[PDB]
Design a protein around this nucleic acid. Sequence first.
DNA 1: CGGGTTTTTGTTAAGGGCTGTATCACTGTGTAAGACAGGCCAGATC
DNA 2: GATCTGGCCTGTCTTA
DNA 3: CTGGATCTGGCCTGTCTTA
DNA 4: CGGGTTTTTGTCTGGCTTCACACTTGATTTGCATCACTGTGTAAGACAGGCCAGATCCAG
DNA 5: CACAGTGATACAGCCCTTAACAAAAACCCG
DNA 6: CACAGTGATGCAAATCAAGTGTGAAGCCAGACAAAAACCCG
Lengths: 111, 410, 222
Amino acid sequence: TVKAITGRQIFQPLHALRNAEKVLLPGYHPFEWQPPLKNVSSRTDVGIIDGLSGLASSVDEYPVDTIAKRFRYDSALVSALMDMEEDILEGMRSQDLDDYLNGPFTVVVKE
Amino acid sequence: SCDGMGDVSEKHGSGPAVPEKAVRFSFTVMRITIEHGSQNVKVFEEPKPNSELCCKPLCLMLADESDHETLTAILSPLIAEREAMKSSELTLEMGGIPRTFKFIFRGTGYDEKLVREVEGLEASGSVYICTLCDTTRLEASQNLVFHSITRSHAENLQRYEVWRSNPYHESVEELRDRVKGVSAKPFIETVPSIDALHCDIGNAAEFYKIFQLEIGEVYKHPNASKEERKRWQATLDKHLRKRMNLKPIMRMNGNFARKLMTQETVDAVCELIPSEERHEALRELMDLYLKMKPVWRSSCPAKECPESLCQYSFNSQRFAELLSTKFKYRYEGKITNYFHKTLAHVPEIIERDGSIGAWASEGNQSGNKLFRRFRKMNARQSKCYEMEDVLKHHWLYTSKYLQKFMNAHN
Amino acid sequence: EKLVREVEGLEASGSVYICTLCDTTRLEASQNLVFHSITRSHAENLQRYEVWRSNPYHESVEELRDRVKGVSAKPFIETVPSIDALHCDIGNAAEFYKIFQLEIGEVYKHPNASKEERKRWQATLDKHLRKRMNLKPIMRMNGNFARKLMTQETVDAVCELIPSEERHEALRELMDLYLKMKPVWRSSCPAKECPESLCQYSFNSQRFAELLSTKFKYRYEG
DNA sequence: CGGGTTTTTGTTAAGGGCTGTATCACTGTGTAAGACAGGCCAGATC
DNA sequence: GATCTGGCCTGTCTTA
DNA sequence: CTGGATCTGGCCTGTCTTA
DNA sequence: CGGGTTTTTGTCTGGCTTCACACTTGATTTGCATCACTGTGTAAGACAGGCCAGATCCAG
DNA sequence: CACAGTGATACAGCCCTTAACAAAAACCCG
DNA sequence: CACAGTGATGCAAATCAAGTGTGAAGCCAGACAAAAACCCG
Ligand SMILES: [Ca+2]
Ligand SMILES: [Zn+2]
Ligand SMILES: [Zn+2]
């Protein structure tokens, strides 16, 4: 409507937004754990992993009647930390701390 | 149109004790016609008759649809205005030129429950089942093909007059037979019609009943316990979930009804009946029903399905013959309302009006949906202001002037 | 609380081992009301379950249950032994509402009452709260209804129905103690917003427990 | 480093009109089963 | 042959 | 004079119809 | 029913703008089509039938 | 001391006008 | 023959360039017509 009436593009089309979404979603920023995570893959591009986690759905196996979707926990934490970059930077700048410091930050998460 | 809305929660605060219900009232223009030369011609007809974008709201209140006193106390001014406007002409300026308007009112978006409640007739479980003719439930299980529209507003008022005055001084049952089941004074002049949505819902529910009876092979076992019927219904529900990908719902709705009426549905159901003749019976039954449905469900049957329209009487007679012959175990001495209506009143309805599906009450239900949305996200959360806000927002949403600014491509 | 009982390896809430932080029973929690520390870690639940499974002392059902303090499921989630403030407020509001119902009916004077009397008492209370507090009857205890029900004017409106006068002062002191204890477990930082309530919390809690034990025996006896 | 001269920048009062923000009274999300004490009949019994 | 025991039930309270 | 066979009234209760 | 008095405008006229105006062709960006479902239809009333209760009639 | 809304109303705030004065920031010359 | 949406997924159509020299529609100096809508004649 806006494009047809105003004869210009004040807003962007849908595909541009779709392409921009892939930055905020998990599985887009590189990272690595210095102690390797036991029983956890080190790949860093996984998105929405299936919730069933490869549960056996054969007819002989225990029946399955649920569906689920979810992310990788560590990838979710990485994405959440990268979302709050500006806030952490401003907090360090306001508390009389040099921004280039790379001390061992401690994070507390409520489940 | 009009309908009652249940499950409307009440808010905290001050004010009178508001019941947990809601009743709306709306109207919709259909066709504008000018008298040019020596005949008539239409100027603007509604392309989407059942669309929510043309259901203009008029009145809104929070009361029970069975609270007759409050309902009449609210709706009497509107009916008085309608009666006063039914014999006047309007002068209106269009583009700088005065124009002349005259109206023809028609109320069809009323479900049978409200029709019975307003027209002063008896309930749905009455012996006088039809609201158009004067037959009982017994003859409605024998003739099925020969009836005629008789009921009317003025006749209802005269009947009520006779019921109150009792001129002949006769007994209660004789007076009931003389009045044909009228025990209240009508106050809304309506026209005899058939709601398409509720008709389809009732037909689908009755078919579902017929299917779950045919699974148990009741045509040879007249005796059946309680758990047997429940088992049968559970087996039917599981088979439908497995084949038709449908969900067993407790109360019949429209989409389930639409997806149920299909030849391959009966084909899948035939996997449960070991017989062979009953398969032919059910298949011919569904074939007749699907050949008949577009007569009363299409938008304009005179153009979209002339073959079904001209060949309707023979199909209805064969349908009644099939009911009386093979389904004698259930349809001997009792029959639903919509079967009688569909089989004995719709040809006259098309020949008198032209269409039925265009006069349905779908747009009213979409307006109920819009009401449930607006009352929750487009109103001030207070009893004193919520209804005004909802009404104004819905009137703005229905306006076509704002809608014209959306088709900016053509 | 329900999910905590489930995942941590505990029974339902209607049992005798009520608290998920201390391991006291129903009677001992209805007697003391004051002094209770916390000894309930996550590995402790695993040890409890292992004792319950292996039964090294070859005890009976009741003895082993008393030893394990009611553990019959292997834990699988490490949770923090804290308190949910929202459900706590809801439960306190519901309990208070029940106490108002009982106070209206004079249960301490007549320990016997039929169901119909309870129905009429609840209807009278609901109608009074509707005519004097702009509230409506609700099936389950709400959240806003809780916050709005906990006011001095509500106590006044309820006392407008009680014929006695000592009950009035009892309810006044009850609500005053509860309002004095409320801001401790509801603020984002009590040590910097309401330090007086925090410093005076123990005394207020002890007086609250003493009030319940003395002048509310008809309900909280055992 | 000042007069003579110049171009920018307020400043008062009263009224008009467009824009932004506080204020009012409220809501929707915290919603099914299990533990337990007391009463009670069927039945083995000494 | 009454006499407790056992299990069966059943209403109430506790989280939702 | 009494008891004794028996006969509708209405009530309550599933059941069918629309929502 | 038509002689004066003002708007309302293409025109001449050639010499000057900023604009207009032909193949590529590989990506690149829009614009439209396609496909499995959906929510609004959501509590009472009429009626037949079985059942005792107390009334209805019958007997020595 | 959950907290993000939710539409209408009132008022502060911030633009506008005229009207003479009055102060501020620079360059010729002495 | 309810219907106005729900999403992604895919394919089809516009574009868009950076190169390039020519072609074309206004704009101007006055200025007397060429109608054309007013007065009423
Ligand atoms: Ca309805
Ligand atoms: Zn009929
Ligand atoms: Zn504890």
